[PDB]
Design a protein around this ligand. Structure first.
Ligand SMILES: [Mn+2]
Ligand SMILES: [Mn+2]
Length: 197
């Protein structure tokens, strides 16, 4: 399931697997994948496989935090990421780098993906990892792992005119808690559904 919304003149599909499908651009957007981070690698790639099979995607765009830290990521993470990519040979991939990605020297060239530094404008949005305001464009960003507490922390889409937050696609603990008092539009991701609050 997904929740169709209209944002900055664009239809966007908030997906229950913590991702955004952008039909006009045939674009799948994810943030904070952390490939190779344990709760592993095979499971994160298989979820992407399913999203790619469910929607007509010509490109995948990663809003930073692609690979988990080399010294702590699951063995051979890099290898089957490479197999996965060339299994999706016709898919265009773009990593928008945050501080961790750029410091790590990610991605390796053998992955055959595109790499830019935040912000990268793709009209009408400035795409970023770090959720800081942009002077000319509305922002889609990640990095803080937004969650909402029910009673239970659930990943949360945060849709806002200035800076919108995608929930982390990959494993994480804690996360920046979005309070009920938020002025933004909130959508919870969990149990295969998206829940507008
Ligand atoms: Mn992250
Ligand atoms: Mn930070």
């Amino acid at each position: 399931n997904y929740q169709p919304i209209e944002h900055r003149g664009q239809a966007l599909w908030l997906l229950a697997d913590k991702a955004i499908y952008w039909p006009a651009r045939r674009a799948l957007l994810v943030a904070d994948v952390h490939i190779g981070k344990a709760a592993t690698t095979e499971a994160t790639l298989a979820r992407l496989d399913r999203l790619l099979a469910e929607h007509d995607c010509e490109q995948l765009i990663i809003l930073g935090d692609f690979l988990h830290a080399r010294t702590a990521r699951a063995p051979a993470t890099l290898a089957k990421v490479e197999d996965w990519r060339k299994r999706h040979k016709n898919l265009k991939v773009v990593l928008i780098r945050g501080n961790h990605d750029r410091n790590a020297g990610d991605p390796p060239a053998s992955l055959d993906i595109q790499v830019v530094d935040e912000p990268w404008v793709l009209e009408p949005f400035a795409l970023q990892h770090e959720p800081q305001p942009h002077g000319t464009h509305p922002v889609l960003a990640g990095h803080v792992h937004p969650v909402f507490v029910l009673r239970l922390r659930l990943p949360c889409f945060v849709i806002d005119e200035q800076v919108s937050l995608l929930p982390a696609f990959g494993e994480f603990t804690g996360g920046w808690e979005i309070t009920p008092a938020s002025a933004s539009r909130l959508y919870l991701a969990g149990a295969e559904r998206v829940w507008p609050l």
